Amino acid sequence: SLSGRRVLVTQADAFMGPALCDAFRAAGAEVVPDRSALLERGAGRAVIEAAGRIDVLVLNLAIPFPSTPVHQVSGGEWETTFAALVHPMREMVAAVLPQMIERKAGKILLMGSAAALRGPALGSSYAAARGAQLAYIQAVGVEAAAHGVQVNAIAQNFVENPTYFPPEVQATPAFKDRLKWQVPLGRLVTADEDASFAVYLCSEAANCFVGQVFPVCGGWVN
Amino acid sequence: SLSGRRVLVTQADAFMGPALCDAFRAAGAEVVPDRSALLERGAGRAVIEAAGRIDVLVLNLAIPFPSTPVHQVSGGEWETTFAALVHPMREMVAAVLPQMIERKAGKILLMGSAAALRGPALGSSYAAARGAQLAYIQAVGVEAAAHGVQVNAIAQNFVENPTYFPPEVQATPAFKDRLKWQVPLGRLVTADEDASFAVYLCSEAANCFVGQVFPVCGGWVN
Amino acid sequence: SLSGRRVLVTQADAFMGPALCDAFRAAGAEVVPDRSALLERGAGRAVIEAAGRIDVLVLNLAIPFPSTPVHQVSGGEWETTFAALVHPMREMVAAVLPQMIERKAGKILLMGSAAALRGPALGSSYAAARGAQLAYIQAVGVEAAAHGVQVNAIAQNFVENPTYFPPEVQATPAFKDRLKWQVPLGRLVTADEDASFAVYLCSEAANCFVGQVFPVCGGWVN
Amino acid sequence: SLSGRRVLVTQADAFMGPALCDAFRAAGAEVVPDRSALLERGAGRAVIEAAGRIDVLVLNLAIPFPSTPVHQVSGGEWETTFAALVHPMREMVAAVLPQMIERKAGKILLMGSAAALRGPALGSSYAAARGAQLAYIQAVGVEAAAHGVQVNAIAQNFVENPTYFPPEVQATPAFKDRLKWQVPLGRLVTADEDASFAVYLCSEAANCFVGQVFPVCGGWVN
Ligand SMILES: [Cl-]
Ligand SMILES: [Cl-]
Ligand SMILES: [Cl-]
Ligand SMILES: [Cl-]
Known part of the structure; x- marks a missing residue:
């Protein structure tokens, strides 16, 4: 039970x-649902500082999947991708660890992407940002283990959610075929299966x- | 809740x-704790058949870790390793799937070894058998997904248990150093952490x- | 150059x-092309012993891809799969290592299967055998590194070859679609690309x- | 032979x-050894544009390994790491692909880091940048395969080189022990082994x- 945990x-x-x-x-936790925009320097540090005590930090971060061929991507699209997915992750982890290290206890979970694990044919800058997330979480988890703090990542794809798998995507035949030929499960992971696994990983x-x-x-991907 | 499940x-x-x-x-399940010897042809099929209804099959299988250099292993040590770890796994999975396929529901979990994922310097025939287990479970899980049956494997090492990590092993300095230099967790996984993850994987x-x-x-290993 | 090497x-x-x-x-090597049947106990040891000096052992091993659902596989089909792919590999590695250890030099390369890495929907016993191969080669490579002997594996699929990708397979539409949706290369690996990589791995x-x-x-698979 | 290739x-x-x-x-190639500083916006595009025809682009990129605990890293150390390792990689790949796509031929090889694959206990921002590199190269390779261009990465560590493994590192006892307990090879990969593999990957x-x-x-790491 995650009772009386923030x-x-x-x-x-x-x-x-x-x-x-x-x-x-x-699961019985006190949930703080932050809706802040995170693009500006210091915004993620502000979210953590405003919250006071954090027992569990769940880095749910996302942008629309860009459709751009790799040679036509601008330096600005690139830096926007990293400003949305990567720089806030670092601000928030670095802001929240000190209290978890002091308590010798705490949970950080990244909701990352399997596109870092299996290259896509159009999301080159998205894939780069998601890879930065995964490698960072790996390194921070090894660091924080010494202090009794658990930092882990889910690397997901084909989960039912409005950002990447809304019904309009599900109706397209390209998706129909992607399930047939690439997803042994033969269906989307439900949002609740994904979220239950997140809860287990923060127990x-x-x-x-x-x-x-x-x-x-x-x-x-396996 | 695994209530009234076998x-x-x-x-x-x-x-x-x-x-x-x-x-x-x-978790509230009806647990059938089988202690049968599994070495003989048909023994694993017998265990499954004697049990009647199985909702969850947990393939906990083990032998002592052999110390033999690869060029001095006999054909008999080899075939004994496979008769203990591999052939019973296949008999039991093939015996239990038909009822799970009919019910369009069921769970099989292998308690396998990370020695299949990271080569050891002395367990060559043990590592081979454990690799057969993992690849089999992978293939069977892809097959059975079509029928609503979930077949998965844990690939473990450095879990507290009497077979591979009894206190005498834990006192040796080689183990002390293996933890220092190879296990980011810095301690053994407890048996109860491992078993809770098994329960989650069968929910x-x-x-x-x-x-x-x-x-x-x-x-x-990651 | 692999000049005057067997x-x-x-x-x-x-x-x-x-x-x-x-x-x-x-590449300039003395090639011994063995066509022996390997099913019988001792056959692989016989091949190695008949050859005298081996500098490079290339374990090219194969059987037809079985089409059997996992619950209808016989114990005999299973043990035949392992007798063709697994037991000869062990006999031959254990027979050839002593001379390579003495020379503090030598190469063993397994031509294994990516079906051990990504579960197939019908090759459950084939996948098990191929996994035994990969885990064995991993363990033996860690052992033999101490002696200056290199033991490695290729894990292949979608390579042009008469056993698994003859033209009749290539014409089927299921294959057409498997390439489209699963092989980023968009074509089969040629036999000569695969073999050149094998040569590099034995240099x-x-x-x-x-x-x-x-x-x-x-x-x-990546 | 890489004869008359740039x-x-x-x-x-x-x-x-x-x-x-x-x-x-x-191997007989025309080698352009660029020593430019790459930190400034546009610097990497300038290197590619100054070179005219590129047949092979080898992204050799490095900074000193930072020693900073994750919670004391500044936003500036972070953005410097990415400005040295990540943003130039993207500028140079995007600048060189158009001519390779037109020629339906070309090679890009990243000299990346296994720290993206196995988390370190102090290189959190270094590990993040190296992960961005690997995921980007994966995505770009899938994109460019359609055009006959091969984009791949080496993920290295424990290779003899002045930046990460100079003699002073090699003498420390921490390194002695890291080899003993973590590197099955039992020695550093030589620079020439690494570079020969790079050449093969660009053939x-x-x-x-x-x-x-x-x-x-x-x-x-495997
Ligand atoms: Cl998703
Ligand atoms: Cl264990
Ligand atoms: Cl193949
Ligand atoms: Cl290195």
Whole structure:
């Protein structure tokens, strides 16, 4: 039971935010659903500082999937991708660790992307940002293990959510075929399956997981 | 809740068997703790057939870790390793799937070894058998996903258990150093952490996992 | 240059054998193309012993891809799969290592399968055998590194060869679609690309690779 | 033979640059050894544009390994790490692809880091940048495969080179022990082994490799 624990969930209305908030409420936690814009220097530090005590930080972060060929990407599209997905992650982790290290206890979970694990044919700058996320979480988890703090990542794809798999995507035949030929599960991971796994990864039972990346994508990548 | 579900656990007194049985009892399941010897042709089929209805099959299988250099291994040591770890796994999976396919529901979990994922310097025939286990579970999970049956594997090492990490091993300095230099967790995974993860992997929340190998080894392998 | 080196290639008329033999001839090696049946106990030891000095052992091993659902596989089909792919590999490695250890030099390369890395929907017993191969080669490579002997594996799929990708397979529409949706390369790896990589892995330049599995499958698995 | 081919190697005096330049000269290529500072916006585009025809782009990029705990890293140290390792990689790939796509032929090889694959206990911002590199190269390789261009990465560690493994590091006892307990090879990969593998990956024999990450670290990671 995550009873009387404070769980902050970023971009709570987007990506996995809704399901995460529901799931952490049902487990009995005090959920702080942050909707702040995170693009500006210092914004992520501000979210953490405004919250006071954090027991669990769930980095739910997302942008629309860019469609740009790799040679026509601007330096600005690139730096926007990293300003949305990468720089806030670092600000928030660095702001929240000190209190978890002091308490010798705490949970950080990244809701990252399997596009860092299996290259896409059009999301080159998206894939780069998501890879920065995964490698950072790995390194921070190894660091923080020494202090009793667990930092881990989900690497997901083909999960039902409004940002990357809304119904309009699901109706396209390209998606139909991507499921047939690439997803052994043969269906989308439901938002609630994903969020229950997140809850497990933020429980004491999961104190043995430090710096680990868990793929959640119906067998699309293993 | 795994309420009124039948969970069969092989070699229940060895390796992870005790912790698994405790954990599945606490989740409210009817636990069948099998202690049969499995070496003989047909023995594993007999265990499954004697049990009648299986909702969850947990393949807890183990032998002592052999110390033999690769060029001095006999054909008989080899075939004994496979007769203990591999052939019973196949008999039991093939015996239990038909009822799970008919019910369009069921769970198979292999308690396998990370030695299949990171080569050891002396367990060549042990590592081969454990690799057969992992690749089989992968293939069977992809097959059975079509029928609503989830077949997955834990790939573990550095978990507290009497077979591979009894106190005498823990006192040796080679182990002291293996933890220091190879296990980011800095301690053994407890038997109960491992068994709780097994329970989660055999719950409905985990219906999204088919044919997946989950490393459970404190960051020894990722 | 592999000049005046003896390179033994098993099942030389099947799978990658032709291309391997051509490629190792062109690099200037003395190629021993073995066509022996390997099913019987002792057959693989006999091949190695008949050859005298081996500098490079290339374990090219294959059987037809079985089509059997996992629950209808017989114990005999299973043990035949392992008798063709697994037990000869062990006999031959254990027979050839002593002379390589004495010379503090030598190369063993397994031509294995990516089906051990990504579960297939019908090759459950084939996938198990191929996984035993990969995990064994990993463990033996870690052992033999101490002696200056390099033991490695290719894990291949979607390579042009008469056993798994003859023209009749290539014409089917299921294959057409498997390439479209699963092989980033968009074509089969040619036999000569595969064999050149094998030659590189058996050169001195590759003395840094011990117990490593190299996927060769056009991005099907990474 | 890489005869009469132009091969540009970035930071040619640092990291793997010397060995790469020697190795590509010996294979008969016209080597362009660039020593430019790459930190400024547009600098990498300038290097590519000044070179005219590029047949092979070898992204040799490096900075000193930072020693900073994750919670004391400044936003500026972070953005400097990415400005040295990540933003120039993108500028140079996007500048050089158009001519390779037009020629339906070309090679890009990243000299990346296994620290993206196995989290370090102090290089959190270094690990993040190196992960961005690997995921980007993966995505670009999948994109460019359609055009006959091969984009791949080496993910290395424990290679002899002045930047990360100079003699002073090699004498420390922490390194002594890291080899003993973590590197199955039991020695450093030589610079020339690493560079020969780079040359192979930029040859036609390697046209089957698109978007693939090859670990080169003596078995430290697999
Ligand atoms: Cl998703
Ligand atoms: Cl264990
Ligand atoms: Cl193949
Ligand atoms: Cl290095």
